[PDB]
A paper describes a structure:
To better understand the roles of cleavage, F2 truncation and substitutions in stabilizing the [name] Pre-F protein, we determined the structures of double-cleaved Pre-F trimers using single-particle Cryo-EM. For a detailed look at the C-terminus of F2 we focused on two variants, [name]-2c with the additional furin site (90RRRR) and [name]-[name] with an alternative furin site (91REKR) with higher similarity to the native sequence. A stable class of Pre-F trimer particles was isolated and refined by imposing C3 symmetry. These structures were resolved to 3.3 Å and 3.1 Å respectively and showed high similarity, with a root-mean-square deviation (RMSD) of ~ 0.55 Å. Our structures showed the long HR2 stem up to residue Gly487, making them the most complete [name] structures to date. While the exact mechanism remains uncertain, our study provided insights that lend support to the double cleavage hypothesis. Unlike previously described structures, the Cryo-EM structures of the Pre-F trimers in this study show a distinct interprotomeric interaction involving the novel F2 C-terminus. Biochemical assays and the Cryo-EM structural analysis confirmed that the postulated F2 C-terminus truncation agrees with the natural folding of the native closed trimer.
Numbering used by the authors:
A (entry chain H), B (entry chain G), C (entry chain I): 103 to 487
D (entry chain B), E (entry chain A), F (entry chain C): 19 to 92
Amino acid sequence: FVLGAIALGRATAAAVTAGVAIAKTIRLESEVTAIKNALKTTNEAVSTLGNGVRVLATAVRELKDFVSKNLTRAINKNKCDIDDLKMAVSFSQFNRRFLNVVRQFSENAGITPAISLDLMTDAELARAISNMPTSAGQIKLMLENRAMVRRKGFGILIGVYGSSVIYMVQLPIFGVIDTPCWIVKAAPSCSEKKGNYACLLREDQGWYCQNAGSTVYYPNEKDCETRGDHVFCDTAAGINVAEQSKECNINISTTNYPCKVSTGRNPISMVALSPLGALVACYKGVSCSIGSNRVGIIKQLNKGCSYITNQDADTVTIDNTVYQLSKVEGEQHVIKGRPVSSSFDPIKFPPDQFNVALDQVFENIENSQAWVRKFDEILSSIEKG
Amino acid sequence: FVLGAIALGRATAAAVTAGVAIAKTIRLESEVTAIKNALKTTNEAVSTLGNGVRVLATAVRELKDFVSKNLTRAINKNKCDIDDLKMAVSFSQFNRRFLNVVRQFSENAGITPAISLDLMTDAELARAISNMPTSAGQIKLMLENRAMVRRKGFGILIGVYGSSVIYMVQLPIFGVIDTPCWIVKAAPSCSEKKGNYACLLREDQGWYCQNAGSTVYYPNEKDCETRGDHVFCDTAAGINVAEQSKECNINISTTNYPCKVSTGRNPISMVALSPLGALVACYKGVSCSIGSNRVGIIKQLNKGCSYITNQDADTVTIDNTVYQLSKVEGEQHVIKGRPVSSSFDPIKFPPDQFNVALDQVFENIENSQAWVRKFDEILSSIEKG
Amino acid sequence: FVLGAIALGRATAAAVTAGVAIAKTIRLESEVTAIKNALKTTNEAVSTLGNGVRVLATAVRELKDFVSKNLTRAINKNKCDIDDLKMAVSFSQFNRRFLNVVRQFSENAGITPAISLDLMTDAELARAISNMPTSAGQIKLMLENRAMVRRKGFGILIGVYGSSVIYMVQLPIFGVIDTPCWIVKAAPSCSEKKGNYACLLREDQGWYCQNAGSTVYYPNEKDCETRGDHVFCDTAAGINVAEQSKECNINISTTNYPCKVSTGRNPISMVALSPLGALVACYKGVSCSIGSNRVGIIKQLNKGCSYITNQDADTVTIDNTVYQLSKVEGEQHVIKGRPVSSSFDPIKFPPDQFNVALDQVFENIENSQAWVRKFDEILSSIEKG
Amino acid sequence: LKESYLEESCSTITEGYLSVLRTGWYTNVFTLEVGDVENLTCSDGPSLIKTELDLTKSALRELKTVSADQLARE
Amino acid sequence: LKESYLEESCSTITEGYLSVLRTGWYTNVFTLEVGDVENLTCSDGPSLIKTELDLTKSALRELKTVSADQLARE
Amino acid sequence: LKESYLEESCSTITEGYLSVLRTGWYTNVFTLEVGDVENLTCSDGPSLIKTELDLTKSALRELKTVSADQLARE
Ligand SMILES: *[C@@H]1O[C@H](CO)[C@@H](O[C@@H]2O[C@H](CO)[C@@H](O[C@@H]3O[C@H](CO)[C@@H](O)[C@H](O)[C@@H]3O)[C@H](O)[C@H]2NC(C)=O)[C@H](O)[C@H]1NC(C)=O
Ligand SMILES: *[C@@H]1O[C@H](CO)[C@@H](O[C@@H]2O[C@H](CO)[C@@H](O[C@@H]3O[C@H](CO)[C@@H](O)[C@H](O)[C@@H]3O)[C@H](O)[C@H]2NC(C)=O)[C@H](O)[C@H]1NC(C)=O
Ligand SMILES: *[C@@H]1O[C@H](CO)[C@@H](O[C@@H]2O[C@H](CO)[C@@H](O[C@@H]3O[C@H](CO)[C@@H](O)[C@H](O)[C@@H]3O)[C@H](O)[C@H]2NC(C)=O)[C@H](O)[C@H]1NC(C)=O
Ligand SMILES: *[C@@H]1O[C@H](CO)[C@@H](O[C@@H]2O[C@H](CO)[C@@H](O)[C@H](O)[C@H]2NC(C)=O)[C@H](O)[C@H]1NC(C)=O
Ligand SMILES: *[C@@H]1O[C@H](CO)[C@@H](O[C@@H]2O[C@H](CO)[C@@H](O)[C@H](O)[C@H]2NC(C)=O)[C@H](O)[C@H]1NC(C)=O
Ligand SMILES: *[C@@H]1O[C@H](CO)[C@@H](O[C@@H]2O[C@H](CO)[C@@H](O)[C@H](O)[C@H]2NC(C)=O)[C@H](O)[C@H]1NC(C)=O
């Protein structure tokens, strides 16, 4: 069970499926007649559909008013070669929004993947947020960060009923706020005895959240996105994990949870940048060093893994490359221990594995010497016994 | 072999390779002189290149007629401060198509990934489809759905040959229509005996198609896209599979084809939405229930897997999360049986596997038993016998 | 380890991290006052930030001049219904650039993924390139290929400080040019003995480069892009590999480097297009042929894998499909040998494996055979001896 | 925030963030009205109003061949 | 359509679709003519036609450094 | 270029390319000035300058709630 492949497609598939399931209801002729009867005297009205879902209906009448009163009063004898020059310039300002919606639906085949400023302007994005069905403290947060609510929507085309384009816009509701999170990053950890290596690497990386006592795990980091401290996640792309899945960060070797690792026998050298530093893994054939921006080279690292605080350096170099660190304030720590890979004999290490629990590598090795010593005892008792 | 990764890149790589191998012929000086001699009289002519392929040549002359006739006669004394205001506004309407081609080819490095209304308009898209080299039944399908033919093209820049931009547009030919298809979905299938588990999961999920007596399999779901019943597949991203591969849907257990699975030892709880329902796996730590839009919670599910018809519910909940079912109309059937996972002993289950045929999980268990019996027979026969 | 997954995310995450880390310095009120005090008389000056970095500061004053000189004198009585029509057609030509920047930072929530022609025009892209800190050999190459330098930037919003939008643009520096490269492609290699198969596939496919004696390996092919001969790679997405890793192209079996393979027990039939040809794997069920654009079919291929030069054919067919070979001039060579998978026995071939070295598929076969041979001697000496 | 360097497994953990989770969708329905631009004609020849009118009429006539999630047969 | 729930393996199969498969490509070659905008010059100072003329000339000049697949360096 | 068909392993290797590698970033800082559009008002009714001016003022007022970092919750 590779948790990174079970996910990867759930968040997008479950968002289109929930949007086409309600366009199938407004598309009728019973609803469209009922919607446009709420908007005959006002420019906005809240209506309830037939399947119980409530929506917000809003009307646009800038181009219809111009055509009805101004234009259809100078084009009398079918003569449009008039010398006014103000109607012909005003007409090209009013229909600028109409022609920009028609281009977005006609090129995206009826479903656009984002809400441009022509579908939903900024004055109408703050009237939708003020109506959403959620508490008062969530509304206030959304109103000052509207650019992150527009960023996760889409549009769908309903039809052309007479002479009026109808369409709908789906917006997210951020109903749960201020609940703890954290992030885990990893790099290979190798050993060596007389030229043989025994590698190891963690595989439970990504974001974790709490929510009223149940932990969730978002494996594909295209789901989440930070702005400062806050993290903007999508609850349809996570996988519930047990409560004691946080014992992998305290005693990995000797828990009862199945911590997931990937093993090997050939070293890899890499830099894995973390939010407040970087992890540098330097091995046999590679040379590394760190430096600053004003001066330059400061010192050179040793073989193995090491932690480079972002208050020590500004660049980290792997044999020819330069990675710029991130300048974020915080406080670091170091937790002592003896690396797990120091416990393996480099000979008699199992073959390459891919997302197996750490209990099975220890069981695989032990099951092997169980039989060799079983055979050695039966061997003597036959001839000598 | 992991069939989902052998693919994943063939569809887009095989389209650009064929696009650039034909631009390399029109870019000669021998072919451009031949194309521009076809359009000296008309505005469209079907011409054959020098390597046997046939193209369609079309010319755009709205701007050149303004500059030739209307414009370079109001500018005689190199004076452009006239009191006209009709040329100053007309000339800002004629060069809005020209200035929007130059913007798209200059930010995309010369190869745009979609056809806009500025490259190929809508009256020149229904003149291409009327000419394609296919039968009359297929043309009628494309002429009514022109928005799904534009969706899969691109443009490539040939040059600026004097004072005239030349480019090219690649359009798809949907030459095979109305052939059977189907889709497969899956979720984990766990078991238990006094606290230990034995999971299992299918790994052949995606779209299959007949085509004149040959099944194909599209493993990455970015390749196919439904509109109602029809599904718009790409034939360069699929892998031919044997005709017996549909036997996996009748008895996965005792068959002869190699059915692909992935095993485990720790439960996963999730919801996998299918086109006419949902599949809900509830296990040792999660609480599941279903409900409807109007009345709320309806009932609470049991432990294990179960199938939820979209005529019975509207939303499904996994411990905190609400998924919205789809309201497509169809049929449903349930095919009884005893799950495969009930046939395994939770102890003496093989370690975690990734895309192995189910034929080998039974062979792995049976090999290990035979050695124990073989070794045991010796122990009794060296002393007692 | 699986090298294709340790990568896949490094290139984009390192680019954004190094961009926000330097907008955090330009956003101080101490640095914004220093920038705007360099542009008090000129329109471009080179300024050093507070942490030792150098930037290039440039100012845009086309709209401020119109509002200060021309627009304000006409509107003196608050009567902006003047009958001029030149102050109302001009004022819509001057704020097209301002109203397009506000449109791109407001839908992308402050970070845009590419440089448009509104953030940085083309005359200001040849003034940054003339200033970059690199040698004159590289600067000249970047000026005839400016469209490939705009393609890999992005922009970030600093703020609105009074009445002046401030933003910044990141551009790449191509500091190393003309250093050798190559590319590797693969296809399955199967064999039969009385109906049983023994597959095999390579896993080190992608781009490799040299750099002053050190080889790098770019596993994900969304990173590199060819234009002619040159390859545009990103140095932050590669993995330093040993110099012996070019012995897998000379001797794959008897070498001592760990060459990665994936195995199986069921054939696959596919076509893998290479730069100057194609590799066609035709097995037990599929029928293949090659053709031309003029003279139709040419011949029918045999079973096993074969190499098709792009001077013999223009199309290759797999049972119903057509693939277009690339038309590029080069040289073709054939290196004789006997395939590796003809040395295996289809019985006692190990189960499916995913990215394991080829030294271990030979050990797995040897270890299981040693126990069988050992076990038959012990039985004899019990009684026969 | 606060970052720990777990030495035993060679990894790190950064705590101190806060969450903002999506829990549903809200729907807005628009009705963009165009008027009676299908009855107005031009009979003088080229001009600015005629070009704008042709553009608007053609946009309406084009938006009727696009379907969100159904095909068109018969 | 029609959907079966296969209990034995906990999966489900939906049948009843129809296919629309791509089988080739078609090429349309355009020719966006512009005219003689290189022999038009202005001398009266700022105006509207001058701005539009300069925009058109600059676009033509900058389109000659873009290549589909070849490096212009040489 | 030059392509070898490696028969033993069933693969191919193509040699003869040249590399163009990125090694750093360069930062350009802009400053797009707008003037004093906040001090100009309109007291007639609908016209063209009024529409343009209202667009410009609204764009300034809108851009001040967009952040590339540090959510504005305060
Ligand atoms: C299209 O035609 C209508 C009339 O058929 C024009 O209506 C004009 O509307 C404005 C304001 O809506 C009015 O002019 C002035 O309005 C201000 C504030 O409302 C008022 O204080 C003044 O006394 C004056 O009434 C008036 O209703 C009308 N203007 C007239 C009759 O001169 C409309 O202007 C036309 N469209 C365009 C684009 O001009
Ligand atoms: C650019 O080209 C010529 C300028 O030489 C303009 O052609 C002029 O426009 C039309 C099209 O032929 C003609 O209008 C006339 O209208 C009367 C109304 O009854 C009708 O009877 C005529 O049959 C004709 O349609 C006009 O005579 C014609 N002038 C000439 C000398 O041919 C064209 O309009 C210009 N375009 C611009 C400035 O945008
Ligand atoms: C905004 O207002 C300013 C001044 O009020 C306008 O500048 C004026 O336009 C040009 C540019 O300097 C000058 O034109 C003149 O043309 C004659 C032609 O022979 C030439 O002899 C002069 O040397 C000059 O080039 C004009 O003098 C200039 N006025 C001043 C006082 O400098 C500007 O055009 C206005 N903005 C717009 C968009 O029109
Ligand atoms: C264009 O005008 C025609 C009349 O010349 C309209 O046709 C009639 O419109 C009235 C409403 O104004 C309806 O009650 C009639 O049923 C219509 N008759 C027919 C035969 O259609 C037509 O609706 C106008 N077009 C538009 C787009 O409004
Ligand atoms: C701009 O004008 C020049 C001459 O004033 C044109 O150059 C001549 O073009 C003719 C073709 O019409 C050729 O026969 C001559 O040999 C050209 N002369 C020279 C010196 O080259 C030029 O073609 C005009 N520009 C455009 C775009 O037509
Ligand atoms: C709009 O005009 C007002 C004056 O009516 C400006 O307010 C004053 O601006 C000057 C700058 O020249 C300051 O020295 C004064 O302290 C301002 N007065 C007050 C009470 O604040 C205002 O700055 C103008 N708006 C803009 C955007 O410049």
